[model samples]
Target: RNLFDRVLHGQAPCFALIARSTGSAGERAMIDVFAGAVSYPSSLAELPLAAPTATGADRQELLVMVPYRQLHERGFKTHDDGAPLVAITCDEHETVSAQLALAAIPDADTALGERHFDIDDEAYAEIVERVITDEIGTGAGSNFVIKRTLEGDLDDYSPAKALAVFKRLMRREVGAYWIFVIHTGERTFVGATPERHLTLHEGCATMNPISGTYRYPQSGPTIDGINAFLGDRKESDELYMVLDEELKMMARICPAGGQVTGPHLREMARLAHTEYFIVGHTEADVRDLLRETMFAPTVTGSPIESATRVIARHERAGRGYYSGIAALIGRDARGGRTLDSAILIRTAEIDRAGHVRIGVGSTLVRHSDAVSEVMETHAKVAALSNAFDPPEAGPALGQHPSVQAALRERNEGIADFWFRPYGGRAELSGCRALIVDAEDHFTAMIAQQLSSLGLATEVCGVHDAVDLARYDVVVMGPGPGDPSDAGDPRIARLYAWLRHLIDEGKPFMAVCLSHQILNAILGIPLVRREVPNQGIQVEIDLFGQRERVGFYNTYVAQTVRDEMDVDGVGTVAISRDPRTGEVHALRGPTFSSMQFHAESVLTVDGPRILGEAITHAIRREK
Candidate 1:
């Protein structure tokens, strides 16, 4: 009781009260409260050497609250900045009774009431249009979650109000991964968020990529409407796109290449959303895992780092707690720290000055309609506002037979690499491959893919000076900016290396940026596309075979001549934009390249393509 009220009364300097379900059936609500707190700066400097193995039955708990600004630690900028990471811990921990908990907190109906949008209808709609044209269409990012603050003035907001709302939220919101409220001296955060940003338990790293909003009907959800929502091309496409972005993150931590499950609905009180579970195992540090998966595209945007830049350009104010995570890091029975974090949507942040803001976002995709998106924003802000009441029971959308069948069918054509465990035959067992990173984290995704193909893969930044003689094959990964810009140091190194690869007859392969550079050096002209190709998947002819591949490039190596004969290297056009004769792939006697990312989740046969490409490149050198 003391713990709950200290967090409720603002008596504790730092604290968190997390209410969650304990069992599967008739799940009992359980509250874990942290008070009598000790605090630490949540920074990368605090990373431990490794996680300790669990050998005891005793368990300890540590709770964390991170703001969205933490992403700036790595270079992705936000509008306004705050403290990096503030972690809270205590010597004493306890679980308390639930009934009298509400009485001590105090909940008056009008304590925190009367809300309005911070962004007006016309202005917000215009921002959405600008994001599509300036960001998504230009290849800066594939999708962006543009947000508007729903603001409400509180006469005299107190921690008591936070406590009151916390209880109210827990009573109503369903299917939430966490029901949490954290008081961090200057700010108070309260929300019942359904999405799990990431969870690391028993060495398994899991991320939930959720998209495609379905506002529950006034009466309730029905089979017809649910099926229609699932069948909608835009909705399904939105879900798949975010999954690809997340797979890029998962590939960084999960070397086994990760697995995907569910087209499950994140059924909430007044809304339901489409989501999938991405899981894999890793031995990475908890902080490293947290850093690598700092934010989810479901909340931020696709091609994540670029989206951050796009967001900074559009949003005038700092996001604060929105899209950031409130995490629970607890010691399991085996002694390893387990992590579970909730993406801060359906959440409210109250400043010390008695001002409140709830963050709501609409996912913008290739098929997005600005007017419909504006309406979605309206539905989201309203749905979260209506979240205070104890929810009346509704028909289970998950239990609907047609809904299940519809969701299951969406995955019938997707590659099994994500649905099943990765167990590829290590054909390149004796070979070593070096992946050169051109500032894009896609190197991580491709590195993992190469590792799964039975090769020893090592990633090096493009600017790093390295001895290239040791590796049998070198794979250059994608990056941002103009590929022909010789002034950029990263591009200079990649350009020099491409020349070396040809002259020395070193086996090499290139993707996107470097792929363009490789062909340009061989006397092919580079041309800017009429439209930037970011996250879209298209079918193209590859070596006389039709394969669907994903492209993310602003410039392509265009050629009137499909075949190029250099003095040192003889090249052949293996793939092209059949309609335009634009080169998508090329092969030389000692090197090969693909303009598409064979590692992308959007690539239907990515692994097979990657394996074949690597094998052919190595064999060419022999």
Candidate 2:
């Protein structure tokens, strides 16, 4: 109650974690701690260093202790501290990068222990043996282990990969592994030593949870303490607020999961990660547990509530170990809980560099800050580093040489624009040039050329230059990602800016997407006329002379609006092949552009647009 309102009321001086990296020992410690902590619902589940595995590997373990208040701020009030699991990870080099690990903290009274533990070498070895034995025994009992092969190529496979393959081949309900992938170059080892875990089913109905915990408390200075306290409570309230709100939305999308909302991943730490659970449960009996357990206005007799242990289960295919109920099926002789199941973090991916990247996300219900949310990912990962520290460059990482070499590699410069025969220095020189949505490669090339000519040039993206008023000419260049994803919101802002700039009648030359943007703004609409235009060019025009040959173009834009067609937009059409009239170019205004590259003289249209644009500028000067 106190925490939630402070954030809502705008408290200042908030803290969040950001950058993080993990070391080899750190990664191992993180996995050891995470696997051990999540399995047991109580704080008593500490990692003992003396534990040794049958394989002779000594292990150390620790249980992460998080409070209900902190958990609430993260947005998982109804998350199961028991069956619900969390995920934590380190970087490729087994170093703890604050960005990876996520932790889940259960309330203290619900905790089974009060003390935290660190293990010595002898103790660590014993703990490792216990953990490994427990994992193997659980796996074997669950049919996760099929054969006990001693060695070969299979020996080197990551435990996680092996587990996944085993599940596929064995076609069983359970499989797990102690996956380890060593970056030979870096000598940094990264791996997932998972026990029985669940994965969210794809295509299963899922809810989108959105939030950023406390950034600014919502209260006056006189009531600062009150605000801070309320902020903590408010942060906790956000967990349920997001869940209940999402529940209503999800109900509209599906029927079975109406009263239930989530164990949204935001509640757990970065390494102790949790994900929304969509399970294929047999009955709605468990639905009440989530409903009552959620922090609702009615739950504790108010509009706000704090965190509690509630098992949120949405009826979908994905309720894996995280959201679904998984406890030891059989008890030991002493009647103590033995093993459990948890949901595996599903929203994760590995980059091309084999970073094995995982992310931490939070939702901001009412008062949220992007800066704070970004930092929260950092904080969670940092907390996990207690188990391990990550390194960027060191002897421990053998890839020091390769990483250095990559940093030293040089790249080729591609010409994005050049002078056309019809339009030379007259158009190229002294034009107020602006580059949009461009990268260092393209920008540097433009900068180098313009600088060589003693021309002052400015480069910007949709960021500030969406408006063309500041410059005499606006230039949009090629980029990496999808361009068509650009919509009215992006273009509309640019349209207003460009129209304002054009209201002053400033010259506009947009290449690629900028071209489409210009056409759209200036009474022309880019309709999907044919297949998307893309290609290199070869000189094929005969009638246009050598001046109009060898052009290149990449867009297949076509005219959409009949009313906007006028004299100001540039030439409307051009013969693709003047030799045979088979080739054509789309034109408008003094606007001369090709379905080909104007910067490249591989076809007639390219040269024409380039020529006309220069001519237009020259004409303006006249």
lDDT, model 1, position 404: 93
Q: Report every candidate's CA lDDT.
A: 0.78, 0.32
> TM-score of each candidate?
0.59, 0.25
Off by over 4 Å in 2: 1-429, 438-443, 446-454, 465-470, 479-494, 521-535, 540-555, 559-612
In terms of lDDT, model 1 sits at 0.78
Candidate 2, residue 158: CA error in Å? 56
Residue range with the least summed lDDT across 10 consecutive positions in model 1: 386-395
Q: What is the per-residue lDDT of model 2 for residues 175-282, given as tens digits with 9 covering 90 to 100?
A: 112222211121112222222221112213333333323222212123353245344643555555544554543453344654344544332222222223333222
Per-residue lDDT of candidate 1, residues 421-452 (tens digit): 65542558778999998889988888877777
Worst 10 residues of 2 by lDDT: 142-151
Clashing residue pairs found in predicted model 1:
42-85, 54-334, 54-335
